[PDB]
């Protein structure tokens, strides 16, 4: 037959970089270095990257290029008994689309909010403020910074929600920003990679320009070198601790995207004899290199705050959305030409998420187009049907309690659910399908087989690597809370529906296909353990 292919090699490389490089490279990696002995954290981060992360990254990329199909068909064409893996992964990515784009909407709201010479989040004398407002971050819960109250009491209006039961009014300024996000995602994804592979040129490259600028602005700041000290001063007392190796393992596995069917779908439009092994190493490196660079951008500024603004580094060295929507903007408002750093900062955050949202959506579309040609012949219709569902339900995230809705999905939509999914991917490839066939498949593509190193990592390391994460992920479990709020019992179990909603397709479709193929049980396993190419 004939399947569409990238109009250029860079279009693919940028689509994969744009997917892999997002906010977690900015608001989590530097925190982990800071939290876990500085430069010493690079040791377990690098080991977990070379034995768990990149082996899984390389697998899906190779596996997607070789089978020329999306996530559902590929795993059906590989281990038919485990076609449910594809099903599981497709709607994990479907769930994530309900909260991830909320971050891009916030980034655009702060962008539109920065069109002035007096950035609003710098003062404590506005209508949205409390008597307990501080000019900069402290370490007492009831006394919040001027930037934290702007984000919480004006942008979010989160003070008006008693919990997830009380979502309250829809913020149509937010609802509008969210629509602009899905509009961009539409006119970039409706015509396929012909146009998608070109938008990533901007969304994946623009952040590097901003990083470059902010890197120079940060290092030229007084106190910049003090932040770099807090960032990278090594302390190997941590390497002996297990919770560090978990942070490294978990960040590695999540900063890269393996198993989400995104890389699968992306590599599926590669040429069969493309050197995907060269592509995996290059793209992996750039993802980690970007986090390492972004660390300087953040901590040069974080030191300037602790040096010239009189704050304790522990109070501003934070992670998650608080770092990009509260902490870093506060420092900008002190700098001259403040208005300039804001606009590029929030555009960087937007472009950092957009190209990741692209891959998640494309993983869904591609997977479904390769299984239901009715929607393959009607792409522009399917995406509008998809994105409108995303927008309508997305209005809940634009309510006054939308964060409680956001935090709920961020915990359950893809946390354990993807770990178990990739666990079977690794088992299906290395054990059911076979490293022999897999290596033989790769040789035919790139001309040489994988080294014994990669084969050992796919067969033993990656499973325990994922197991290592899933075990300790369950040990440190505690019910869902945000600030002084404790989610009700029913909301907790709701996230378990969402988690198991995907994973259940793995044993379900196994059962449904075991009961649909005729023969004896070993006669049925053998019919469901032989690939389509055979």
């Amino acid at each position, epitope marked *: 037959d004939e399947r569409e292919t990238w109009s250029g090699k860079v279009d693919f490389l940028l689509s994969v970089i744009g997917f892999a490089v997002d906010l977690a490279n900015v608001w989590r990696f530097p925190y982990l270095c800071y939290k876990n002995g500085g430069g010493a954290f690079l040791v377990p981060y690098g080991i977990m990257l070379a034995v768990g992360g990149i082996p899984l990254f390389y697998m899906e990329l190779a596996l997607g290029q070789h089978n020329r199909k999306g996530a559902i068909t590929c795993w059906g064409r590989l281990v038919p008994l485990f076609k449910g893996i594809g099903y599981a992964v497709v709607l994990i990515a479907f769930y994530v689309g309900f909260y991830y784009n909320v971050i891009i909407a916030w980034s655009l709201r702060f962008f539109f909010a920065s069109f002035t010479n007096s950035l609003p989040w710098t003062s404590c004398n506005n209508i949205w403020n409390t008597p307990n407002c501080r000019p900069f971050e402290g370490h007492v819960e009831g006394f919040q910074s001027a930037a934290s109250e702007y984000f919480n009491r004006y942008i979010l209006e989160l003070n008006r929600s008693e919990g997830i039961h009380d979502l309250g009014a829809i913020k149509w300024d937010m609802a509008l920003c969210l629509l602009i996000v899905y509009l961009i995602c539409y006119f970039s994804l409706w015509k396929g990679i012909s146009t998608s592979g070109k938008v990533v040129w901007f969304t994946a490259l623009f952040p590097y320009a901003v990083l470059l600028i902010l890197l120079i602005r940060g290092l030229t700041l007084p106190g910049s070198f003090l932040g770099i000290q807090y960032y990278l001063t090594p302390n190997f007392s941590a390497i002996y601790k297990a919770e560090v190796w978990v942070d490294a393992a978990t960040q590695v596995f999540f900063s890269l995207g393996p198993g989400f069917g995104v890389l699968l779908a992306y590599a599926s439009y590669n040429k069969y004899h493309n050197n995907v092994y060269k592509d995996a190493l290059l793209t992996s490196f750039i993802n980690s290199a970007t986090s390492f660079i972004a660390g300087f951008v953040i901590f040069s500024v974080l030191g300037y705050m602790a040096h010239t603004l009189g704050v304790r580094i522990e109070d501003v060295a934070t992670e998650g959305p608080g770092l990009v929507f509260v902490v870093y903007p506060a420092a900008i408002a002190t700098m001259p030409a403040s208005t300039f750093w804001a606009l590029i900062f929030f555009m960087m955050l937007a472009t950092l998420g957009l190209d990741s949202s692209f891959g998640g959506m494309e993983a869904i579309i591609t997977a479904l187009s390769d299984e239901f040609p009715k929607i393959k012949r009607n792409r522009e219709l399917f995406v509008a049907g998809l994105f409108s569902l995303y927008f309508v339900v997305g209005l809940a995230s634009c309510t006054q309690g939308g964060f409680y809705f956001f935090h709920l999905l961020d915990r359950y939509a893809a946390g354990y659910s993807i770990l178990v999914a990739v666990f079977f991917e690794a088992i299906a490839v290395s054990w059911i399908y076979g490293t022999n066939r897999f290596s*033989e498949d790769i*040789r035919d593509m790139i*001309g040489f087989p994988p080294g014994r190193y990669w084969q050992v990592c796919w067969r033993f390391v990656a499973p325990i690597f994922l197991l290592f994460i899933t075990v300790y992920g369950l040990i440190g479990y505690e019910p869902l809370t945000y600030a002084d709020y404790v989610y009700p019992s029913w909301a907790n179990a709701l996230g378990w529906c969402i988690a198991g909603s995907s994973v259940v397709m793995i044993p379900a479709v196994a059962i449904f296909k075991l009961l649909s193929t005729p023969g004896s049980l070993r006669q049925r396993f053998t019919i469901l353990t032989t690939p389509w190419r055979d």
Partner: antibody
Amino acid sequence: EVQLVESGGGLVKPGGSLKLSCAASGFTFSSYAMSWVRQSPEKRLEWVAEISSGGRYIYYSDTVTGRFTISRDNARNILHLEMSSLRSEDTAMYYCARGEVRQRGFDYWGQGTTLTVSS
Amino acid sequence: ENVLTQSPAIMSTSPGEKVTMTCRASSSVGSSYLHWYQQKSGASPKLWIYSTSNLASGVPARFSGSGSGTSYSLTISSVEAEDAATYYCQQFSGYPLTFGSGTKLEMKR
């Protein structure tokens, strides 16, 4: 170390069939893609067929396709070439070569077995 | 198919001199897919140079490889009589795989 021994082959009549065999020893035969290369009596090297490690990827030259069948016995470590509709231009010495890495060529060759196709 | 032509066809050299042989392809070949074989009279071929310039195991350093695209060359710095043989190039970047037409190196006396 690695050793390859081609066997079978001698004189056939035009149209006849014949089956050549290569006995591998000294390495994990099932881990390496093998190929049949031949050399006409005018001393010209011509690649004939390649078979992948597991025998799932097969390539024929356009001069022998439909007539030659390459196969693999990873249990006994034997390589096979089944010939049918034999023509005189198929007269050559047939070499069994080991070449798993394309970026490395054929690093090991047998000693050849001779095939003469004449009436 | 990608025709590989070698010149010269026959070549006579006095021991110690410097020989150069060329291999010209009808279609560009990746520098990493071009190899060379040495075949002695009445014996089997042996892999000599792989990936344009890398010497195989047991190959003395007087041999070098060079080239790109459609033009490659094998060079022997100072020839020895144990180098008298026919040298074949090969491409492995396209099926059908193809061998060059050969260069026979003979000893001058």
